[PDB]
Amino acid sequence: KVIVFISGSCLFGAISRSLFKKLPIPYTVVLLILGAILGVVASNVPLVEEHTRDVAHMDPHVLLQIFLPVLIFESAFAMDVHTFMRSFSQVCILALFGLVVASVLTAVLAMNLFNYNWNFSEAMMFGAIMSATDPVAVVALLKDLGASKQLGTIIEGESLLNDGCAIVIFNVFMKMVFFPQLTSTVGQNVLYFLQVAVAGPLWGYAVAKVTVFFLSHIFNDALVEITITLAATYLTYYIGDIWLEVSGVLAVVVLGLIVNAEKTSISPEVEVFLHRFWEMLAYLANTLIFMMVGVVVTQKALVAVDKMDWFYLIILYLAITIIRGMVISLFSPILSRIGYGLTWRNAVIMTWGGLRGAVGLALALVVENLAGNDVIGSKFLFHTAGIVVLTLVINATTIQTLLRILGMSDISIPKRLAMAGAVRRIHEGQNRTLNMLKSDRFLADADWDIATAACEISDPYSSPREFADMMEEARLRMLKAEKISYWKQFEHGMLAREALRLLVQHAEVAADEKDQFILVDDLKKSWQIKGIYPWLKRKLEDLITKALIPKLILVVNGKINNQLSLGYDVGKGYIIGEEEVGKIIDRMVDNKKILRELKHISETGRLQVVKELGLLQREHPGIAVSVKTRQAIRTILNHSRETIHELQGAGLLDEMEAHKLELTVEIKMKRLMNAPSSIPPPPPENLLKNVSWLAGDMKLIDFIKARASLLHFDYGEVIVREGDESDGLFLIVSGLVKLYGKEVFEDYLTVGNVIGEMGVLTKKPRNATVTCETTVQVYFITAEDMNIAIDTFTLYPSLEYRLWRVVAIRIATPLIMEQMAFQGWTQEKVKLHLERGYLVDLAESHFQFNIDATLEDVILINGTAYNAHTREEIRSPCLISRTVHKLTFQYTATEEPRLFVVRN
């Protein structure tokens, strides 16, 4: 029976972990102490052994085959993959250097200390045991303190490589030692080394790729993805183990880091459930193994205790600390030379960053059980248990005190100021809500002292050199204002998460250096296509059965395209940022020279950044249109979600249907996320011109031979000025313009509109000024082209009637929104319901039209009319009231009357 032992183990771990949270020490030593407690009954009363002897002696196979894979997999499952791959090369080379030197320096101290009959193999055993690492406690406490993000992820990163290489070296040397009958030739050894090296990782890569491709074909299902993920993970581990006894751990590590690298094709509930399940398994295993070593070491290491061994325990700690500090200090210059160097504070927290854990204890138990009836294994356990308990119990306190005195974990002034402002905002919000609650007529019998005292909220926190200090304060104000503007810019759905993280990383590293601002060379290389990728691009485009080659090449290009997309929008963000510079920095500033130099560097950055964006869009337009479409879809769907949540909160519908509406918009989200990243070609300009307006006339296709200029106007170029003679005409084909006219009005004209309408109709000069806020492509149309079009209309003036209706809309809408006869009319209503209309020719009516009940809206566009009863001479563009039912018009060649009629 083993039920009582494991159940009590779970209960003891639960109570200890829950209780011992106030102190900064990890709870695990309590478990260890509990094991030592069992030691005393492990010497006295037989009832405990007969209930614990079966669990006291697991076969080593179950330990090395079950506990190691799950712990190593969990250590590799909670990673931030993007931050890890930001600096993967540096951390892996530093980790491999550290582990090889820590392994090789153990032999000299082993021979200088013990002077026993211990070969180099025993030294390798000891070095493999002592080099294990555990980052859980330190990363948990630094998240509790919130010092830095890249620090925590690299700290949790290198422990994976340390543990993997340690178990590899241990296991090969262990097969060398305890089974000497095996072949130990150099050729077989290098074959074993290379085999797994090149295979296990690629085997895991292949299985991860095929399982994520299979997972990509699942929509709105709940069970199959978890079932298939668990099955794939186990099958990968089993195949890896049956191939090589060692390679399974590396295979599951690579599988975990790949599957954690994908989040877009899997629903959020799936990975939060998977994270919870795996973390629970790891916690259970950790508690069990720590209590296990605690109970076994007391009964085992009772006879090998010695004072010289205690002195050895004292000196191995100083040895490991000094060698780790020395190696990180001497490879610090190499880290500085590569361009990813860290500060001396980062070095000194690297000095105390080491922490052993469960994996070293596991390897200790398994090497004991392979050792068998010998005092040497008990010696190993005594050393490793002593060193791990002392190193963690003093390491936690030392790092806590070190960050206390050095104070890199202290929060900054801007963030605590913002937190205090938020607290005060919440305070007066609840104050005014309470004041509203006072006036209610149904809650007057309730007291308020307990109500206020139970709902309080508080923050958890609680000379030229003068010119330099004040400009430093000013740059701090500028940087906090810009990053909060960046957050606001991204919260309306207008940016991407990766773009946000890269941009705030750039801002933070720019602000870290003294008197250093945001710079663009980092942005330049962020959008620049460097590395071996252009080399392989040139190779693939030069070399181009056969069917496998081209398809992959396509998505290969897409990868590069994806990169460029990110670059484009991050530059886009900076534009908005510098836009805020133009509208914020003029208020909190107090000095003139500092203000003007900050403005000056602002312009210089702006003019430096506009040009390369212009060239990248001028050579690669499909990327621009694709990311713009992604932008538009993201923002409109985000606002749709916000307004459906508002309508739910408005109480106009129950939440049961809202629970399906959110599913509908969620499947729309995940359809968007798997966007056609393959770049769609921009639509043809002539095709867009044909689509934009109902050009049913074939002479309009013949008008392409009369209207084909493709003229470009750059930023700020005024096209026409008011008062100029109406000679030309323009059709916009690329860009957006702003028109100012005369009260006064401002309009925005996009692609697909005609300009110069009144100058041809009324033969009047220019009256409104148009400006272009970007490079714009336009077609040039002459007055001779207008005459040719008028000839082409012949019996049926299609475009003439269409433009008459259009100009009627542009005249009517301001007076509709201004007059009291139309109040509450929206832009869409006046742009949609007014389209159903036509014109009446006055030649057939002898310039005498009778208004009846069928007519609903009559607007005089041009000409002068007279009332048939009061002889009221009215002129354009006054709106005609419904009182008049008959009008008289004079046939004037200089000003032909124009009227619009709307039927019922």
Ligand X SMILES: Nc1ncnc2c1ncn2[C@@H]1O[C@@H]2COP(=O)(O)O[C@H]2[C@H]1O
* Binding-site sequence positions for 3',5'-cyclic GMP: 756-758, 766-767
Query: Binding partner of residue 643 among a copy of itself, ligand AJP, ligand X, none, CB under 5 to 8 Å per kind?
Result: a copy of itself
Query: Binding partner of residue 767 among ligand X, a copy of itself, ligand AJP, none, CB under 5 to 8 Å per kind?
Result: ligand X
Q: Of the candidates 109, 207, 285, 503, which one interacts with ligand AJP according to CB under 6 A?
A: 285
Query: What is the footprint of a copy of itself within residues 126-165 (CB under 8 A)?
Result: 146
Q: Going residue by residue from 688 to 727, which x/- string records binding to ligand X, judged by CB under 6 A?
A: --------------------------------------x-
Query: What is the footprint of a copy of itself within residues 607-666 (CB under 8 A)?
Result: 621, 624-625, 628-629, 631-633, 635-637, 639-640, 643-644, 647-654, 656-657, 660, 664
Q: Which residues are annotated as a binding site for 3',5'-cyclic AMP?
A: 756, 758-759, 766-767
Q: Of the candidates 300, 572, 689, 766, which one interacts with ligand X according to CB under 6 A?
A: 766
**Inter-axis angle of helices 150-178 and 68-75, nearest 10:** 160
Burial 208-230 (b: 16+ CB within 10 A, else e): beebbeebeeeeeeeeebeeebe
The three-state secondary structure class of 734 is strand
Distances (CA, A) of 151 to 142, 147, 163, 258, 389: 9, 8, 19, 22, 25
Torsions phi, psi of 769, nearest 5? -110, 130
Determine, following the binding rule CB under 6 A, whether residue 100 of this chain makes contact with ligand AJP: no
Determine, following the binding rule CB under 6 A, whether residue 66 of this chain makes contact with ligand AJP: yes
Determine, following the binding rule CB under 6 A, whether residue 234 of this chain makes contact with ligand AJP: yes
Query: Binding partner of residue 288 among ligand X, ligand AJP, a copy of itself, none, CB under 5 to 8 Å per kind?
Result: ligand AJP
* Piece of 281-289, 367-375, 433-441, 729-737 that binds ligand AJP (CB under 6 A): 281-289
Query: What is the footprint of ligand X within residues 809-868 (CB under 6 A)?
Result: 810
Query: What is the footprint of ligand AJP within residues 327-346 (CB under 6 A)?
Result: none
Cβ 450 to a copy of itself shortest distance, Å: 6
Identity of the residue, 409 or 774, whose beta carbon is nearer to a copy of itself in the bound complex = 774
Q: Is 290 within 8 Å of 28 (Cβ atoms)?
A: yes
| Residue 495 burial (CB count, 10 A) | 21
Give CA–CA dist 411/144, Å, rounded.
Answer: 12
Cβ 722 to ligand X shortest distance, Å: 8
Cβ 643 to ligand AJP shortest distance, Å: 43
Torsions phi, psi of 803, nearest 5? -70, -30
Q: Of the candidates 44, 188, 398, 767, which one interacts with ligand X according to CB under 6 A?
A: 767
Torsions phi, psi of 367, nearest 5? -70, -30
Identity of the residue, 767 or 782, whose beta carbon is nearer to ligand X in the bound complex = 767
Cβ 729 to ligand X shortest distance, Å: 7
Distances (CA, A) of 159 to 295, 354, 366: 27, 9, 21
Q: Is 202 within 8 Å of 239 (Cβ atoms)?
A: no
Determine, following the binding rule CB under 6 A, whether residue 759 of this chain makes contact with ligand X: yes
Q: Going residue by residue from 193 to 232, which x/- string records binding to ligand X, judged by CB under 6 A?
A: ----------------------------------------
Q: How many CA atoms lie within 13 A of 116 on its CB side?
A: 12
Give CA–CA dist 828/830, Å, rounded.
Answer: 6
Identity of the residue, 42 or 758, whose beta carbon is nearer to ligand X in the bound complex = 758
Torsions phi, psi of 900, nearest 5? -115, 135
Breaks (C-N over 2.5 A) in the chain follow: 462, 544, 742
Q: Going residue by residue from 197 to 236, which x/- string records binding to a copy of itself, judged by CB under 8 A?
A: --------------------xx--xxxx-xxx--x---x-
Q: Which residues are annotated as a binding site?
A: 756-759, 766-767
Determine, following the binding rule CB under 8 A, whether residue 439 of this chain makes contact with a copy of itself: yes
Cβ 206 to ligand AJP shortest distance, Å: 20
Determine, following the binding rule CB under 6 A, whether residue 747 of this chain makes contact with ligand X: yes
The three-state secondary structure class of 754 is strand
Annotate 432-472 with DSSP letters as a single string: HHHHHHHT-SS-TTS-SHHHHHTS----S---HHHHHHHHH
Give CA–CA dist 270/226, Å, rounded.
Answer: 7
Of 111, 159, 613, the C-alpha closest to 353 is 159
Identity of the residue, 830 or 855, whose beta carbon is nearer to a copy of itself in the bound complex = 830
Query: Binding partner of residue 529 among ligand AJP, a copy of itself, ligand X, none, CB under 5 to 8 Å per kind?
Result: none
The three-state secondary structure class of 745 is strand
Cis ω before 682 (30° cut-off from 0): no
Identity of the residue, 61 or 721, whose beta carbon is nearer to ligand X in the bound complex = 721
Determine, following the binding rule CB under 6 A, whether residue 354 of this chain makes contact with ligand X: no
Query: What is the footprint of ligand AJP within residues 242-271 (CB under 6 A)?
Result: none
Query: What is the footprint of a copy of itself within residues 445-504 (CB under 8 A)?
Result: 445-451, 454-455, 457, 460, 484-485, 487-489, 491
Identity of the residue, 671 or 886, whose beta carbon is nearer to a copy of itself in the bound complex = 671
Determine, following the binding rule CB under 6 A, whether residue 386 of this chain makes contact with ligand X: no
Cβ 234 to ligand AJP shortest distance, Å: 5
Cβ 879 to ligand X shortest distance, Å: 15
Of 459, 454, 455, 453, the C-alpha closest to 423 is 459
Determine, following the binding rule CB under 8 A, whether residue 554 of this chain makes contact with a copy of itself: no
The three-state secondary structure class of 219 is coil
Give CA–CA dist 831/805, Å, rounded.
Answer: 11
Cβ 782 to ligand X shortest distance, Å: 13
Identity of the residue, 679 or 755, whose beta carbon is nearer to ligand X in the bound complex = 755
Distances (CA, A) of 97 to 90, 104, 304, 334, 455: 11, 11, 35, 12, 55
Give the number of residues in contact with ligand X, rule: CB under 6 A: 14
Identity of the residue, 65 or 409, whose beta carbon is nearer to ligand AJP in the bound complex = 65
The three-state secondary structure class of 879 is strand
Query: Binding partner of residue 285 among ligand X, ligand AJP, a copy of itself, none, CB under 5 to 8 Å per kind?
Result: ligand AJP
What DSSP element (H or E) covers 255?
helix 247-260
Determine, following the binding rule CB under 8 A, whether residue 678 of this chain makes contact with a copy of itself: no
Give CA–CA dist 614/621, Å, rounded.
Answer: 10
Strands 745-749, 737-741: parallel, antiparallel or unpaired by DSSP? antiparallel
Identity of the residue, 196 or 291, whose beta carbon is nearer to ligand AJP in the bound complex = 291
Give the number of residues in contact with ligand AJP, rule: CB under 6 A: 16
Strands 864-867, 737-741: parallel, antiparallel or unpaired by DSSP? unpaired
Query: What is the footprint of a copy of itself within residues 727-786 (CB under 8 A)?
Result: 734-736, 738, 748, 750-751, 773-774
Of 230, 227, 237, the C-alpha closest to 278 is 230
Give CA–CA dist 44/302, Å, rounded.
Answer: 14
Quick one: the chain helix, strand, coil %, rounded to 5? 65, 5, 30
Cβ 74 to a copy of itself shortest distance, Å: 13
Enumerate the H helices of 685-797 as residue ranges.
Answer: 685-692, 698-702, 758-761, 783-793
Q: Is 471 within 8 Å of 595 (Cβ atoms)?
A: no
Q: Of the candidates 668, 670, 699, 885, which one interacts with a copy of itself according to CB under 8 A?
A: 668
Quote the radius of gyration of the chain (alpha carbons, Å): 38
Determine, following the binding rule CB under 8 A, whether residue 575 of this chain makes contact with a copy of itself: yes
Q: Going residue by residue from 727 to 746, which x/- string records binding to ligand X, judged by CB under 6 A?
A: ------------x-x-----
Q: Of the candidates 284, 420, 695, 830, which one interacts with a copy of itself according to CB under 8 A?
A: 284
Q: Which residues bind ligand AJP (CB under 6 A)?
A: 1-3, 6-7, 10, 54, 58, 62, 66, 230-231, 234, 284-285, 288
Q: Which residues bind ligand X (CB under 6 A)?
A: 726, 739, 741, 747, 755-759, 764, 766-768, 810
